[PDB]
Amino acid sequence: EVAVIDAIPLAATEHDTMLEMSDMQVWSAGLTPSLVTAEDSGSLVPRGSKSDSNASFLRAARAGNLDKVVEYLKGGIDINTCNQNGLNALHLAAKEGHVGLVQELLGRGSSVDSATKKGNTALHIASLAGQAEVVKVLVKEGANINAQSQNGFTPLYMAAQENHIDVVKYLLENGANQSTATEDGFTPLAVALQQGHNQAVAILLENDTKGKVRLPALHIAARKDDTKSAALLLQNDHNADVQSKMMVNRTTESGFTPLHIAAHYGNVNVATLLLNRGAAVDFTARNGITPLHVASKRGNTNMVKLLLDRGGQIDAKTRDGLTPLHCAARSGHDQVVELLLERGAPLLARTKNGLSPLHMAAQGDHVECVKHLLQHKAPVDDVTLDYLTALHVAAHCGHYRVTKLLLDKRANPNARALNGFTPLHIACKKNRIKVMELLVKYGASIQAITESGLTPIHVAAFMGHLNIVLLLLQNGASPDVTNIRGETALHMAARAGQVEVVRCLLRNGALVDARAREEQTPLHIASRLGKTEIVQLLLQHMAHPDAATTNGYTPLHISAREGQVDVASVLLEAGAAHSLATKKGFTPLHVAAKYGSLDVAKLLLQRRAAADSAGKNGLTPLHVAAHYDNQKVALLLLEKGASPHATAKNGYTPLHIAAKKNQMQIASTLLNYGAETNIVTKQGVTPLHLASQEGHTDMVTLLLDKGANIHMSTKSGLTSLHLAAQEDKVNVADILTKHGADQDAHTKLGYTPLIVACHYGNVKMVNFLLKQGANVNAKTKNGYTPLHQAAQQGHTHIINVLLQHGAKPNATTANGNTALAIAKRLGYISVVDTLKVV
């Protein structure tokens, strides 16, 4: 996979800039007090046999008709009857200010602190509506002055919200607690401050001392620019030496000080007061956001002027290096930018990635910011760490106006970034048509290449940006320029699967059988990736279907390896040769027999492809199939008439191959097709020999079930009981004498399977041998008995068991050599000892 067609850094640098500059945002959630909703008297319709009358009674309460009400009370009407919302007669009377009705209702035994569905007492309803007189009656009758409705609202909160001075002043005098807050954390002070009721704020502040009530109020004052309130709130904040402990520098939950907040909304007036009260100009929140950053991001020109004058660091940088000049520039606040510059903000300050303020302005298509920065002599082609110019960035974003400006300001349209990427390469990758045309007009080289040899047209074709591919061709781009792999735009278009692009290049003269590395054409790549439609397209434009790679693979061979059945079909239907060979001498059928592509194999056999095609090695597809344990494909061939008696150059049949690699199923299938087992190679090898040698227990069983001789000698005189001993095949040999394999059999050098079993130290092997008729006294050609071999190689346990069976130690060779003469010749100390005990 090509990962080289990515300007890898830039998306990920936009994000770093974004999410460390999108996070300078005061969560007004806790600075905007929640406002109470008053209980709407309902239509008061019937909802019981007293249904119509309970409803008629409530309307009488709302209208303040004491007379009609008393008659209902005497008439059997329950005084606690209410509407859908839980509003009773005392609530309705309370809202309208019908004082006399209220005393009367309380007199008739109406529950005072009876609450509605929303938790409103008569006192809540009365306070919000400003019925000071109803309240005096309610307070005096012992109503709960600190009762809370559903969201935590208290009567003092409501009175402050609706600027009912007299109610507030009264509620406070009777010990109402203004510290008691809502669920979202708002106090009567906070809401009075939010509503701009300075008169109410003044009163509330006179009663309570706590900064616990005060701090959230101050933040709100900061947002609302309430200088008058801010001054009052800070009446007790004494100038201390530890700034973070002064109330004016205490933060919200977002780490923002009051000054950050004033900076955000551009509240010069409140900020000035805050600062005069010892506000810290460079207190930081989150990832190093100073107030100066915030005002800068916000374009609050006058705030910036103020913070700088108060000793605010013009060059403070965030965690990734944003200076205030970066921020104003990113946001397109040209007036703030020129100001920061004029106050001497560092013009070429860099972020972690090396972007200057000019790069930020280029991102946001901010013309005026770019003009001011260039005006103050910012290098038009100033580069980042990845060697991107402002022009590279504007092209990636597809920003026309800034691109046009930068080019007019003599930016190099061929400036090469880190990987040779030009602005034109990037514009073509991000499919930026208007920018792309603009760059060409200002002189970008149409056929410049990257460090990996990619041209603009390689890139646009690979990305499928069709309109771009066209424009490049219309501007003279050659579709035959090669990258470092030697691939053209067609190769890259085929690799990506961009069908309409492949067509376009082809209708525009692309060399169809253009050779890349390994001499592979686009037809080869399409076949490998199973791009069926593209295989048809190339073939339609005179692609030679028998074109081979360096190692000799045709697109058909490739179909066989990848199991592309559909691809294989289009090729054969185009006149693809079905029996061409690779450098290793494999036909497409062989390849299918190696990778187990059964559907491809079937399609080939139906096309007059030889089931028994050979190579330089003389191997058929069946041989191959047998080796790689491809059971179905192996079965397919036999049915399509592949000889199981087919031999290679070495002499191996398919049965031979299956025997060695323990291919049970494939071995079974061959035998069912009449595969002879008693057939030898050049050096006298049967599949029975190969099966035994590798120690394939069940395999030797199957070979003898279907007629194999257990006694066939090689050209050196070795049977399969010989080989089962040479490779310590204990299980194999134990089945072989169960079917009668003579041990007495000698080779051409006259050594029996009892000579071999003793030469490699096989204890249990020599035991079972003497158990079916083998003799310890049996000599070889040189004269060696089992005790002559067991005394030569220092086998201690084999001499012991040989002397327990009757191996005479007084036997010589033809030149006169006993077991004791070899054991003394090599210095074996416990071996000369046991030959003189027996």
Numbering used by the authors: 1584 to 1630, 2026 to 2816
Question: What text appears in the publication on this structure?
Answer:
Using isothermal titration calorimetry (ITC)-based quantitative binding assays, we identified a 48-residue auto-inhibitory segment (residues 1577–1624, referred to as ‘AS’) as the complete ANK repeat-binding region. After extensive trials of screening and optimization, we succeeded in obtaining good-diffraction crystals of AnkR_AS fused at its C-terminus with the AnkB_repeats and solved the structure of the fusion protein at 3.5 Å resolution. The residues connecting AS and ANK repeats (10 residues in total, ‘GSLVPRGSGS’) are flexible, indicating that the fusion of the two chains together does not introduce obvious conformational restraints to the complex. The 24 ANK repeats form a left-handed helical solenoid with each repeat rotating anti-clockwise by ∼16°. The inner αA helices and the finger loops of the 24 repeats line together to form an elongated concave inner groove, and the αB helices of the repeats form the solvent-exposed convex outer surface. The ANK repeats superhelix has outer and inner diameters of approximately 60 Å and 45 Å, respectively, and a total height of ∼150 Å. In the complex, AS adopts a highly extended structure binding to part of the inner groove formed by the N-terminal 14 ANK repeats (R1–14) with its chain orientation anti-parallel to that of ANK repeats. A 10-residue segment of AS (residues 1592–1601) forms an α helix when bound to ANK repeats. The binding of AS to ANK repeats can be divided somewhat arbitrarily into three sites (sites 1, 2, and 3) formed by the repeats 2–6, 7–10, and 11–14, respectively. The interactions in site 2 are mediated both by hydrophobic and hydrogen bonding interactions, while interactions in site 3 are mainly hydrophobic.
Ankyrins are a family of scaffold proteins which play essential roles in connecting numerous ion channels, cell adhesion molecules, and receptors to the spectrin-based cytoskeleton beneath membranes and thereby provide mechanical support for plasma membranes and control the activities of excitable tissues including neurons and muscles. There are three members in the human ankyrin family: ankyrin-R/B/G (AnkR/B/G) encoded by ANK1/2/3, respectively. They all consist of a highly similar N-terminal membrane binding domain composed of 24 ankyrin (ANK) repeats, a spectrin-binding domain comprised of two ZU5 domains, and a UPA domain followed by a death domain (DD) and a variable C-terminal regulatory domain. The wide-ranging physiological functions of ankyrins are the result of ankyrin's remarkable capacity for binding to and anchoring numerous membrane targets, via their N-terminal 24 ANK repeats, to specific membrane micro-domains in coordination with spectrin-based cytoskeletal structures. The 24 ANK repeats of ankyrins form a superhelical solenoid with an extremely conserved elongated inner groove, which contains multiple quasi-independent target binding sites.
